[PDB]
């Protein structure tokens, strides 16, 4: 709590912060870029000896003859290592001009496929599709009249749109799919509470992605994968999983336990509550919910881990049907409210908290 | 791996980075930060609900939607909060201005970026971003291959845009040029300047209100010039630099070259030269690229701004103060300045005789 004195020297610091705000949106979207144009990729798999490479000899692997490609990339190259998105080593040209070479930056590991094939790239794609930017237009409209910045946007609520939209269906699907990929796979080094269980049920749990490796890491069990039916259609037939169409509000398929994983945070508490009740009926005396969420922290403080649980509380607003990120005690709150009578935070990776609510404490 | 975790949570932060000044344009076009500044003092604090209340609405979760558009900007210090415990036992959180919002909302004189961010984050702006990888495998501009023309052909065929951007602009360079005026002498003097590309005429006016007694002219294109407002003093003028530039003592250019090719730089330096008396000036504000993608709010400024003028303009780009004295140099000025600096815009004048 130092006071800072408004001076010349804060002003310019002020104004320049501004600036950065207006336009910040360039990050993204070039990010979104060299993304599509596999940028990172050919970096990872070309880079020289030395971990750099020119933007020219990046360009030379891209299908292009367009002679400014090595100037547009570096252009591109250059706002991303400024954020440090990738690294960067100058050197000095004939003409004592410096030209930039470019480097993978520890995030590229996220950003690029690791050995299973995945990565949050296909995240990003979703996160920046040009569908899912139309909300933001309407974001201060639900505001004023109520409602939904996305259903302001295009007629109806967003699940019903991927129902008629089959490219974004696909990105969508598999942004989840390989996000959740990722985190699923650090949860089950950690976590042991699927041991045991005979059924277990994945309410919203996408094409499949999470349910097949359950499976796979217990054979014993019967999965059950269940989402709405425009996503069931075109699920990988995964060996061990059974795909169930549906619409969890109505009800869900029993099981021993049931997974949730970004179902809560999609759903106003009222919507919760049903779905919470709707799972209590589901499950045998001594069943639990098995919740996979962010957790809200206790104040807006300026952390990356912080501000990733802040712009998902955001991307609900924009997209969902009351959708908002939770605290513990609010989720801890909507599983007394549905009867359950125990609750624990079991485990956690990449600020995905897992949770269990209990039948029986 | 607390290191693999924080390089996960790095991308997710990346993914939906459009969260922050999307949420900061609808708390712009709402007018929270006007509530804000009007209603408690500057280092007081404010409710989402009592901001709600100013807003024409009866929506009973405008208050709660705005806390958590506002928790986004707190996390980013675009505001400040403190926190306030409910007898649940769960905290909300109050909030009030940080510095920036001085800039984001009405300063003394009328102006703040806000319509620059508006600009900045129109749908229409936007749009281009979607053909860049295109642009770059096929050759040509974002922004053509969205709207089939250049911005400034599509700016006089939309007439809400063009009023956008030149507030945008207008707002943004009354903030620079009041600083400059303050440190800069280079106007002193003059009988006659021309402001070249000089929009809606901003900086004329504020040039000849500090110099009652100089001509300005402020020459643009024409569906520009029809909105410019007039201002004793300066003569709003109509044309295509690229076909000549009005005569005067000293020319300025403000983010002209920057939305330019090196050849049309010269191009453009060169009618410049040939519209100034034999020791007169091209005045030019604009951005100086730094020698490294740098970390810095400043840096980064500067590289979004090189970036925008990728997705938008015909060759377009920041240049360094070694690239600006070639241009200055290719275009016959012997002699180049750099005289003042204000929010990141340098003043350099090129000068026909040192
Ligand atoms: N009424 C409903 N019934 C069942 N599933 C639904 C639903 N409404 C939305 N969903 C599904 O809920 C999911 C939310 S996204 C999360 C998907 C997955 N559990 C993961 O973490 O990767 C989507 O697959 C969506 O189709
Ligand atoms: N051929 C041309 N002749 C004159 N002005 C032009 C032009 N092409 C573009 N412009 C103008 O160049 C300006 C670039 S934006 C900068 C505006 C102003 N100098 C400021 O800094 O606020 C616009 O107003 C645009 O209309
Ligand atoms: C098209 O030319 C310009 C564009 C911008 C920024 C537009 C969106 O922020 C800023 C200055 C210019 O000279
Ligand atoms: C519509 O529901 C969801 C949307 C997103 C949105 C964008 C992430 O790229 C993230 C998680 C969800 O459960």
């Given at each position: ?123 990003l794609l979703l996160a920046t599709d040009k569908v899912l930017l139309e909300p933001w237009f309407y974001l201060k409209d639900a ?219």
């Amino acid at each position: 709590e130092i006071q800072i004195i408004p001076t010349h020297s804060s002003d310019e610091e002020a104004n320049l912060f501004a600036m950065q705000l207006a336009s910040a949106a360039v990050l993204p979207m070039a990010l979104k870029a060299a993304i599509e144009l596999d940028v990172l990729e050919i970096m990872a798999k070309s880079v020289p000896p030395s971990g750099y490479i020119s933007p020219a000899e990046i360009a030379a692997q891209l299908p292009t003859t367009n002679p400014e490609a090595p100037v547009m990339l570096d252009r591109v190259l250059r706002l991303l290592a400024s954020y440090s998105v990738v690294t960067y080593t100058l050197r000095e040209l004939p003409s004592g001009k410096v030209e930039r070479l470019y480097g993978l930056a520890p995030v590229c590991k996220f950003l690029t496929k690791n050995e299973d094939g995945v990565s949050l790239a296909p995240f990003l794609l979703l996160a920046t599709d040009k569908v899912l930017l139309e909300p933001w237009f309407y974001l201060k409209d639900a505001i004023l009249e109520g409602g939904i910045p996305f259903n302001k946007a295009y007629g109806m609520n967003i699940w019903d749109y991927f129902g008629t939209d089959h490219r974004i269906n696909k990105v969508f699907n598999k942004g989840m799919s390989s996000n959740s990929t990722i985190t699923m796979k650090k949860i089950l080094e950690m976590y042991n509470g699927f041991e045991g269980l005979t059924t277990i049920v994945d309410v919203g749990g996408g094409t499949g992605a999470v349910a097949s490796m359950i499976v796979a890491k217990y054979p014993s069990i019967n999965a059950i994968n269940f989402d709405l039916p425009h996503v069931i259609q075109d699920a990988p037939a995964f060996s061990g999983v059974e795909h169930l169409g549906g619409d969890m509000f109505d009800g869900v398929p029993k099981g021993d336990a049931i997974f949730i994983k970004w179902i809560c945070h999609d759903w106003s508490d009222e919507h919760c509550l049903k779905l919470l009740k709707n799972c209590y009926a589901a499950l045998p005396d001594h069943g639990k919910v098995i919740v996979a969420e962010y957790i809200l922290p206790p104040s807006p403080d300026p952390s990356i881990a912080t501000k990733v649980v802040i712009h998902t509380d955001a991307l609900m607003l924009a997209y969902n049907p009351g959708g908002k990120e939770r605290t513990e005690k609010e989720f801890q709150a909507l599983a007394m409210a549905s009867g359950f009578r125990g609750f624990k935070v079991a485990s956690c990776a990449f600020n995905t908290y897992v949770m269990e609510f209990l039948k029986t404490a």
